mmCIF file of C-alpha atoms in Angstrom:
data_model
loop_
_atom_site.group_PDB
_atom_site.id
_atom_site.type_symbol
_atom_site.label_atom_id
_atom_site.label_comp_id
_atom_site.label_asym_id
_atom_site.label_seq_id
_atom_site.Cartn_x
_atom_site.Cartn_y
_atom_site.Cartn_z
ATOM 1 C CA UNK A 1 -25.426 73.040 -118.102
ATOM 2 C CA UNK A 2 -26.259 76.454 -119.522
ATOM 3 C CA UNK A 3 -28.934 79.116 -119.514
ATOM 4 C CA UNK A 4 -27.866 80.473 -122.909
ATOM 5 C CA UNK A 5 -30.916 80.558 -125.217
ATOM 6 C CA UNK A 6 -32.073 81.301 -128.726
ATOM 7 C CA UNK A 7 -35.557 82.741 -129.209
ATOM 8 C CA UNK A 8 -37.769 82.660 -132.298
ATOM 9 C CA UNK A 9 -40.178 85.422 -131.362
ATOM 10 C CA UNK A 10 -42.903 84.596 -133.870
ATOM 11 C CA UNK A 11 -46.156 86.497 -134.220
ATOM 12 C CA UNK A 12 -48.117 83.312 -133.617
ATOM 13 C CA UNK A 13 -45.691 81.120 -131.654
ATOM 14 C CA UNK A 14 -42.475 81.633 -129.706
ATOM 15 C CA UNK A 15 -39.854 78.882 -129.576
ATOM 16 C CA UNK A 16 -36.821 78.773 -127.354
ATOM 17 C CA UNK A 17 -33.753 76.636 -127.871
ATOM 18 C CA UNK A 18 -31.531 76.226 -124.810
ATOM 19 C CA UNK A 19 -27.838 75.473 -125.138
ATOM 20 C CA UNK A 20 -27.149 71.833 -124.366
ATOM 21 C CA UNK A 21 -30.865 70.913 -124.380
ATOM 22 C CA UNK A 22 -32.479 71.840 -127.732
ATOM 23 C CA UNK A 23 -36.018 73.211 -128.057
ATOM 24 C CA UNK A 24 -37.406 73.629 -124.512
ATOM 25 C CA UNK A 25 -40.401 75.932 -125.118
ATOM 26 C CA UNK A 26 -42.913 76.287 -127.931
ATOM 27 C CA UNK A 27 -45.961 78.371 -127.010
ATOM 28 C CA UNK A 28 -48.452 80.786 -128.510
ATOM 29 C CA UNK A 29 -47.252 84.391 -128.573
ATOM 30 C CA UNK A 30 -50.321 85.596 -126.642
ATOM 31 C CA UNK A 31 -50.732 87.513 -123.391
ATOM 32 C CA UNK A 32 -53.974 87.838 -121.431
ATOM 33 C CA UNK A 33 -54.364 90.873 -119.171
ATOM 34 C CA UNK A 34 -56.847 91.526 -116.359
ATOM 35 C CA UNK A 35 -57.897 94.966 -115.170
ATOM 36 C CA UNK A 36 -53.686 96.050 -115.996
ATOM 37 C CA UNK A 37 -52.220 92.845 -114.599
ATOM 38 C CA UNK A 38 -50.745 89.913 -116.553
ATOM 39 C CA UNK A 39 -53.208 87.106 -116.254
ATOM 40 C CA UNK A 40 -51.685 84.420 -118.482
ATOM 41 C CA UNK A 41 -49.074 83.959 -121.179
ATOM 42 C CA UNK A 42 -48.603 81.324 -123.816
ATOM 43 C CA UNK A 43 -50.401 78.016 -123.876
ATOM 44 C CA UNK A 44 -53.220 78.978 -121.505
ATOM 45 C CA UNK A 45 -53.713 82.395 -123.101
ATOM 46 C CA UNK A 46 -54.294 81.208 -126.661
ATOM 47 C CA UNK A 47 -57.846 79.950 -126.192
ATOM 48 C CA UNK A 48 -58.718 83.226 -124.504
ATOM 49 C CA UNK A 49 -58.392 85.058 -127.853
ATOM 50 C CA UNK A 50 -61.837 86.230 -128.909
ATOM 51 C CA UNK A 51 -63.317 84.851 -125.654
ATOM 52 C CA UNK A 52 -62.508 87.341 -122.946
ATOM 53 C CA UNK A 53 -65.137 88.692 -120.559
ATOM 54 C CA UNK A 54 -65.415 92.349 -119.661
ATOM 55 C CA UNK A 55 -62.543 92.549 -117.195
ATOM 56 C CA UNK A 56 -59.924 90.991 -119.527
ATOM 57 C CA UNK A 57 -58.150 91.175 -122.878
ATOM 58 C CA UNK A 58 -56.001 88.764 -124.851
ATOM 59 C CA UNK A 59 -53.357 90.245 -127.066
ATOM 60 C CA UNK A 60 -50.844 89.041 -129.667
ATOM 61 C CA UNK A 61 -48.207 91.661 -129.065
ATOM 62 C CA UNK A 62 -46.064 90.860 -132.137
ATOM 63 C CA UNK A 63 -47.304 91.913 -135.520
ATOM 64 C CA UNK A 64 -45.705 91.837 -138.885
ATOM 65 C CA UNK A 65 -42.469 90.548 -137.365
ATOM 66 C CA UNK A 66 -41.779 93.420 -134.962
ATOM 67 C CA UNK A 67 -43.249 94.820 -131.718
ATOM 68 C CA UNK A 68 -46.659 96.564 -131.529
ATOM 69 C CA UNK A 69 -47.488 97.106 -127.755
ATOM 70 C CA UNK A 70 -44.093 97.448 -126.140
ATOM 71 C CA UNK A 71 -45.100 96.843 -122.579
ATOM 72 C CA UNK A 72 -47.043 93.686 -123.355
ATOM 73 C CA UNK A 73 -44.316 92.315 -125.656
ATOM 74 C CA UNK A 74 -41.743 92.831 -122.943
ATOM 75 C CA UNK A 75 -43.907 90.999 -120.392
ATOM 76 C CA UNK A 76 -44.313 88.137 -122.867
ATOM 77 C CA UNK A 77 -40.538 87.841 -123.432
ATOM 78 C CA UNK A 78 -39.758 88.039 -119.704
ATOM 79 C CA UNK A 79 -42.348 85.380 -118.974
ATOM 80 C CA UNK A 80 -40.888 82.886 -121.444
ATOM 81 C CA UNK A 81 -37.277 83.550 -120.443
ATOM 82 C CA UNK A 82 -38.158 83.060 -116.787
ATOM 83 C CA UNK A 83 -40.048 79.867 -117.554
ATOM 84 C CA UNK A 84 -37.008 78.194 -119.180
ATOM 85 C CA UNK A 85 -34.479 79.313 -116.558
ATOM 86 C CA UNK A 86 -32.563 76.311 -115.189
ATOM 87 C CA UNK A 87 -31.293 76.952 -111.671
ATOM 88 C CA UNK A 88 -28.704 74.195 -112.220
ATOM 89 C CA UNK A 89 -27.231 76.084 -115.160
ATOM 90 C CA UNK A 90 -24.537 78.715 -115.435
ATOM 91 C CA UNK A 91 -25.485 82.414 -115.325
ATOM 92 C CA UNK A 92 -24.739 85.413 -117.550
ATOM 93 C CA UNK A 93 -27.194 84.138 -120.153
ATOM 94 C CA UNK A 94 -26.374 84.852 -123.758
ATOM 95 C CA UNK A 95 -29.553 85.362 -125.806
ATOM 96 C CA UNK A 96 -29.767 85.134 -129.566
ATOM 97 C CA UNK A 97 -32.975 86.437 -131.089
ATOM 98 C CA UNK A 98 -33.948 86.594 -134.734
ATOM 99 C CA UNK A 99 -35.109 89.742 -136.481
ATOM 100 C CA UNK A 100 -36.692 90.229 -139.906
ATOM 101 C CA UNK A 101 -34.412 91.251 -142.738
ATOM 102 C CA UNK A 102 -34.971 99.271 -139.000
ATOM 103 C CA UNK A 103 -32.324 100.190 -136.423
ATOM 104 C CA UNK A 104 -35.283 101.326 -134.323
ATOM 105 C CA UNK A 105 -36.786 97.838 -134.643
ATOM 106 C CA UNK A 106 -33.568 95.999 -133.873
ATOM 107 C CA UNK A 107 -33.019 98.140 -130.773
ATOM 108 C CA UNK A 108 -36.478 97.340 -129.415
ATOM 109 C CA UNK A 109 -35.988 93.562 -129.343
ATOM 110 C CA UNK A 110 -32.432 93.987 -128.164
ATOM 111 C CA UNK A 111 -33.104 96.209 -125.173
ATOM 112 C CA UNK A 112 -36.264 94.251 -124.592
ATOM 113 C CA UNK A 113 -34.433 90.948 -123.980
ATOM 114 C CA UNK A 114 -31.912 92.633 -121.650
ATOM 115 C CA UNK A 115 -34.726 93.310 -119.156
ATOM 116 C CA UNK A 116 -35.268 89.561 -118.473
ATOM 117 C CA UNK A 117 -31.798 88.593 -117.366
ATOM 118 C CA UNK A 118 -30.159 88.427 -120.768
ATOM 119 C CA UNK A 119 -26.572 89.452 -120.031
ATOM 120 C CA UNK A 120 -25.710 89.710 -123.731
ATOM 121 C CA UNK A 121 -28.017 89.731 -126.762
ATOM 122 C CA UNK A 122 -27.046 88.738 -130.313
ATOM 123 C CA UNK A 123 -29.289 89.405 -133.301
ATOM 124 C CA UNK A 124 -29.536 87.085 -136.297
ATOM 125 C CA UNK A 125 -31.410 87.733 -139.515
ATOM 126 C CA UNK A 126 -34.436 85.456 -139.569
ATOM 127 C CA UNK A 127 -33.823 83.933 -143.057
ATOM 128 C CA UNK A 128 -30.224 83.107 -142.139
ATOM 129 C CA UNK A 129 -31.444 81.291 -139.020
ATOM 130 C CA UNK A 130 -34.159 79.523 -141.040
ATOM 131 C CA UNK A 131 -31.598 78.361 -143.558
ATOM 132 C CA UNK A 132 -29.188 77.031 -140.940
ATOM 133 C CA UNK A 133 -32.018 75.178 -139.236
ATOM 134 C CA UNK A 134 -33.272 73.705 -142.533
ATOM 135 C CA UNK A 135 -29.815 72.233 -143.053
ATOM 136 C CA UNK A 136 -28.753 74.384 -146.031
ATOM 137 C CA UNK A 137 -24.973 74.581 -146.673
ATOM 138 C CA UNK A 138 -24.895 78.273 -145.750
ATOM 139 C CA UNK A 139 -21.152 78.266 -144.972
ATOM 140 C CA UNK A 140 -20.124 76.898 -148.353
ATOM 141 C CA UNK A 141 -19.186 78.864 -151.491
ATOM 142 C CA UNK A 142 -22.493 77.912 -153.054
ATOM 143 C CA UNK A 143 -25.871 79.593 -153.420
ATOM 144 C CA UNK A 144 -28.783 78.496 -151.261
ATOM 145 C CA UNK A 145 -32.199 80.081 -151.350
ATOM 146 C CA UNK A 146 -34.634 80.089 -148.470
ATOM 147 C CA UNK A 147 -38.230 81.262 -148.218
ATOM 148 C CA UNK A 148 -39.414 81.507 -144.583
ATOM 149 C CA UNK A 149 -43.142 82.039 -144.407
ATOM 150 C CA UNK A 150 -43.516 83.288 -140.842
ATOM 151 C CA UNK A 151 -46.545 84.750 -139.137
ATOM 152 C CA UNK A 152 -45.748 88.422 -139.708
ATOM 153 C CA UNK A 153 -43.484 88.346 -142.748
ATOM 154 C CA UNK A 154 -42.152 86.154 -145.523
ATOM 155 C CA UNK A 155 -38.343 86.378 -145.618
ATOM 156 C CA UNK A 156 -36.668 85.487 -148.899
ATOM 157 C CA UNK A 157 -32.917 85.218 -149.091
ATOM 158 C CA UNK A 158 -29.995 83.888 -151.018
ATOM 159 C CA UNK A 159 -27.147 82.771 -148.818
ATOM 160 C CA UNK A 160 -23.481 81.984 -149.415
ATOM 161 C CA UNK A 161 -20.252 81.803 -147.379
ATOM 162 C CA UNK A 162 -21.991 82.433 -144.040
ATOM 163 C CA UNK A 163 -23.616 85.617 -145.272
ATOM 164 C CA UNK A 164 -26.504 87.136 -147.119
ATOM 165 C CA UNK A 165 -26.196 87.810 -150.828
ATOM 166 C CA UNK A 166 -29.762 89.056 -151.151
ATOM 167 C CA UNK A 167 -32.579 89.370 -148.656
ATOM 168 C CA UNK A 168 -36.054 90.854 -148.563
ATOM 169 C CA UNK A 169 -38.885 90.852 -146.001
ATOM 170 C CA UNK A 170 -42.445 91.126 -147.306
ATOM 171 C CA UNK A 171 -45.393 91.717 -144.982
ATOM 172 C CA UNK A 172 -47.371 88.691 -146.037
ATOM 173 C CA UNK A 173 -47.366 85.497 -144.044
ATOM 174 C CA UNK A 174 -49.535 83.386 -141.789
ATOM 175 C CA UNK A 175 -51.340 86.343 -140.224
ATOM 176 C CA UNK A 176 -52.298 87.771 -143.624
ATOM 177 C CA UNK A 177 -53.545 84.358 -144.688
ATOM 178 C CA UNK A 178 -55.776 84.118 -141.609
ATOM 179 C CA UNK A 179 -57.024 87.668 -142.202
ATOM 180 C CA UNK A 180 -57.825 86.787 -145.840
ATOM 181 C CA UNK A 181 -59.821 83.799 -144.600
ATOM 182 C CA UNK A 182 -61.727 86.058 -142.152
ATOM 183 C CA UNK A 183 -62.495 88.616 -144.859
ATOM 184 C CA UNK A 184 -63.546 85.835 -147.189
ATOM 185 C CA UNK A 185 -66.030 84.368 -144.701
ATOM 186 C CA UNK A 186 -67.553 87.844 -144.232
ATOM 187 C CA UNK A 187 -67.997 88.593 -147.952
ATOM 188 C CA UNK A 188 -68.868 85.141 -149.213
ATOM 189 C CA UNK A 189 -70.632 83.477 -146.308
ATOM 190 C CA UNK A 190 -71.969 86.478 -144.365
ATOM 191 C CA UNK A 191 -70.169 85.018 -141.377
ATOM 192 C CA UNK A 192 -67.980 86.763 -138.836
ATOM 193 C CA UNK A 193 -65.420 84.313 -137.521
ATOM 194 C CA UNK A 194 -62.710 84.683 -134.878
ATOM 195 C CA UNK A 195 -59.004 84.429 -135.393
ATOM 196 C CA UNK A 196 -58.755 81.033 -133.811
ATOM 197 C CA UNK A 197 -61.357 79.617 -136.166
ATOM 198 C CA UNK A 198 -59.581 81.306 -139.101
ATOM 199 C CA UNK A 199 -56.322 79.607 -138.119
ATOM 200 C CA UNK A 200 -58.162 76.277 -137.843
ATOM 201 C CA UNK A 201 -59.467 76.700 -141.370
ATOM 202 C CA UNK A 202 -55.985 77.548 -142.695
ATOM 203 C CA UNK A 203 -54.503 74.474 -140.997
ATOM 204 C CA UNK A 204 -57.253 72.002 -141.822
ATOM 205 C CA UNK A 205 -58.188 72.966 -145.399
ATOM 206 C CA UNK A 206 -55.863 75.795 -146.409
ATOM 207 C CA UNK A 207 -54.310 75.335 -149.868
ATOM 208 C CA UNK A 208 -52.336 77.305 -152.442
ATOM 209 C CA UNK A 209 -54.161 75.515 -155.307
ATOM 210 C CA UNK A 210 -57.721 74.533 -156.101
ATOM 211 C CA UNK A 211 -58.134 70.749 -155.736
ATOM 212 C CA UNK A 212 -62.353 68.874 -152.243
ATOM 213 C CA UNK A 213 -62.321 68.304 -148.473
ATOM 214 C CA UNK A 214 -64.714 70.414 -146.375
ATOM 215 C CA UNK A 215 -65.144 71.352 -142.730
ATOM 216 C CA UNK A 216 -67.812 72.926 -140.515
ATOM 217 C CA UNK A 217 -67.113 76.482 -139.388
ATOM 218 C CA UNK A 218 -69.112 78.518 -136.887
ATOM 219 C CA UNK A 219 -69.398 82.161 -135.971
ATOM 220 C CA UNK A 220 -71.632 85.237 -135.865
ATOM 221 C CA UNK A 221 -74.085 86.044 -138.635
ATOM 222 C CA UNK A 222 -72.998 89.259 -140.314
ATOM 223 C CA UNK A 223 -76.266 91.186 -140.258
ATOM 224 C CA UNK A 224 -78.507 89.416 -137.752
ATOM 225 C CA UNK A 225 -75.757 88.790 -135.177
ATOM 226 C CA UNK A 226 -76.836 85.214 -134.124
ATOM 227 C CA UNK A 227 -74.624 82.041 -133.991
ATOM 228 C CA UNK A 228 -74.428 80.160 -137.258
ATOM 229 C CA UNK A 229 -72.627 77.241 -138.885
ATOM 230 C CA UNK A 230 -71.508 76.964 -142.501
ATOM 231 C CA UNK A 231 -69.551 74.422 -144.547
ATOM 232 C CA UNK A 232 -66.421 75.593 -146.334
ATOM 233 C CA UNK A 233 -64.311 73.627 -148.768
ATOM 234 C CA UNK A 234 -60.703 73.547 -149.945
ATOM 235 C CA UNK A 235 -61.799 75.235 -153.131
ATOM 236 C CA UNK A 236 -63.246 78.100 -151.175
ATOM 237 C CA UNK A 237 -60.128 78.107 -148.958
ATOM 238 C CA UNK A 238 -57.992 78.353 -152.124
ATOM 239 C CA UNK A 239 -59.875 81.384 -153.333
ATOM 240 C CA UNK A 240 -59.572 83.037 -149.911
ATOM 241 C CA UNK A 241 -55.781 82.556 -149.885
ATOM 242 C CA UNK A 242 -55.056 83.430 -153.532
ATOM 243 C CA UNK A 243 -53.956 87.020 -152.945
ATOM 244 C CA UNK A 244 -51.464 86.415 -150.146
ATOM 245 C CA UNK A 245 -50.092 83.302 -151.890
ATOM 246 C CA UNK A 246 -49.544 85.390 -155.034
ATOM 247 C CA UNK A 247 -47.675 88.009 -153.027
ATOM 248 C CA UNK A 248 -45.424 85.292 -151.678
ATOM 249 C CA UNK A 249 -44.892 83.824 -155.161
ATOM 250 C CA UNK A 250 -44.100 87.299 -156.515
ATOM 251 C CA UNK A 251 -41.501 88.068 -153.829
ATOM 252 C CA UNK A 252 -39.720 84.801 -154.716
ATOM 253 C CA UNK A 253 -39.620 85.861 -158.373
ATOM 254 C CA UNK A 254 -38.174 89.233 -157.451
ATOM 255 C CA UNK A 255 -35.416 87.625 -155.409
ATOM 256 C CA UNK A 256 -34.460 85.317 -158.303
ATOM 257 C CA UNK A 257 -34.117 88.354 -160.539
ATOM 258 C CA UNK A 258 -31.439 89.669 -158.170
ATOM 259 C CA UNK A 259 -29.254 86.574 -158.135
ATOM 260 C CA UNK A 260 -25.679 86.765 -159.553
ATOM 261 C CA UNK A 261 -24.809 84.361 -162.432
ATOM 262 C CA UNK A 262 -22.717 81.780 -160.554
ATOM 263 C CA UNK A 263 -25.183 81.658 -157.673
ATOM 264 C CA UNK A 264 -28.009 81.432 -160.163
ATOM 265 C CA UNK A 265 -26.266 78.362 -161.550
ATOM 266 C CA UNK A 266 -26.097 76.767 -158.071
ATOM 267 C CA UNK A 267 -29.815 77.536 -157.523
ATOM 268 C CA UNK A 268 -30.806 76.159 -160.912
ATOM 269 C CA UNK A 269 -29.523 72.750 -159.756
ATOM 270 C CA UNK A 270 -31.327 72.511 -156.419
ATOM 271 C CA UNK A 271 -33.996 75.184 -156.171
ATOM 272 C CA UNK A 272 -35.660 76.745 -153.147
ATOM 273 C CA UNK A 273 -36.193 75.626 -149.515
ATOM 274 C CA UNK A 274 -39.424 76.565 -147.681
ATOM 275 C CA UNK A 275 -39.494 77.059 -143.935
ATOM 276 C CA UNK A 276 -41.885 78.464 -141.374
ATOM 277 C CA UNK A 277 -45.539 77.940 -140.620
ATOM 278 C CA UNK A 278 -46.466 78.818 -144.197
ATOM 279 C CA UNK A 279 -44.248 76.076 -145.607
ATOM 280 C CA UNK A 280 -46.963 73.632 -144.504
ATOM 281 C CA UNK A 281 -49.602 75.299 -146.672
ATOM 282 C CA UNK A 282 -50.754 72.497 -148.992
ATOM 283 C CA UNK A 283 -49.506 72.993 -152.551
ATOM 284 C CA UNK A 284 -47.404 76.083 -151.879
ATOM 285 C CA UNK A 285 -44.315 74.164 -152.953
ATOM 286 C CA UNK A 286 -46.036 73.171 -156.242
ATOM 287 C CA UNK A 287 -47.297 76.702 -156.788
ATOM 288 C CA UNK A 288 -43.812 78.196 -156.408
ATOM 289 C CA UNK A 289 -42.260 75.529 -158.638
ATOM 290 C CA UNK A 290 -44.857 76.264 -161.318
ATOM 291 C CA UNK A 291 -43.988 79.972 -161.309
ATOM 292 C CA UNK A 292 -40.175 79.636 -161.181
ATOM 293 C CA UNK A 293 -39.369 76.380 -162.945
ATOM 294 C CA UNK A 294 -37.212 75.411 -159.966
ATOM 295 C CA UNK A 295 -37.354 72.465 -157.558
ATOM 296 C CA UNK A 296 -38.980 73.440 -154.280
ATOM 297 C CA UNK A 297 -38.302 71.536 -151.065
ATOM 298 C CA UNK A 298 -40.198 71.842 -147.793
ATOM 299 C CA UNK A 299 -37.881 71.760 -144.780
ATOM 300 C CA UNK A 300 -38.012 69.122 -142.116
ATOM 301 C CA UNK A 301 -39.743 70.491 -139.017
ATOM 302 C CA UNK A 302 -40.367 73.807 -140.779
ATOM 303 C CA UNK A 303 -41.927 75.500 -137.735
ATOM 304 C CA UNK A 304 -38.715 74.893 -135.793
ATOM 305 C CA UNK A 305 -36.100 75.833 -138.398
ATOM 306 C CA UNK A 306 -35.500 79.348 -137.123
ATOM 307 C CA UNK A 307 -35.051 78.274 -133.513
ATOM 308 C CA UNK A 308 -32.870 75.293 -134.466
ATOM 309 C CA UNK A 309 -30.756 77.577 -136.656
ATOM 310 C CA UNK A 310 -30.179 80.133 -133.919
ATOM 311 C CA UNK A 311 -29.525 77.152 -131.630
ATOM 312 C CA UNK A 312 -26.685 75.951 -133.868
ATOM 313 C CA UNK A 313 -24.992 79.335 -133.573
ATOM 314 C CA UNK A 314 -25.533 79.320 -129.829
ATOM 315 C CA UNK A 315 -23.658 76.024 -129.516
ATOM 316 C CA UNK A 316 -20.706 77.351 -131.588
#
């Protein structure tokens, strides 16, 4: 019985895999503070976003894949590590954490996990972890290509022989999609919506291609400030998400351009694997296939691929 863990420190959700147990924590990456004292972290903090009274704030301390407010991020990490501690398990915890594909950035997560009891910290590139967790043959002399559409970044990589052949991190992912939905509601519906509503829209009717289905969305009228409800459809959702989807599609194309001939041949036969919260975006697989001519597969349990991948390393 071990306290070794692997952490996917996502901008929207944090998952922890514990050696010998598997995924033991999956919670929103949100911290609420009361005036500053930590009021709540994770599951109970998420619904506080956009809803805090005067004495309180609710913060997503990770943004674009790295750390924004250092103090709050550190409290978030310490909270989750403490929550999964097993007093029946061995000590000297080894912690693996993923990082997007700067030395400054790597150091921050590294030193940051040491403060919670991590005895030793190992860093893994996020797309490598995603690929391992999606079940790609990353150890073989064969090209595999992964696209991990995380909250803060989309990581595109070509893997072979336990290493990275090509990798790139683009700052477009789930957070940018939500923000595009928010901006769209403002311009097209004169409606100011919160982030939690934006995420609901993305999950319920988000699509990478025009179809459709509709849902009822509420918020604050743009000019007159009062509560209001509007109907939005998949077609509108598609228009909202077009720009960030195109940025994702374009990064994939750029990565393909960089692929060596023999690896290109391996990728021609099997295509691209999508992981991460964005992999669930309806039609994104079709959209990428249309622009590349390659098969596109959505991973099993795509939200968990990174944590499961780091978890595999942790067990070996």
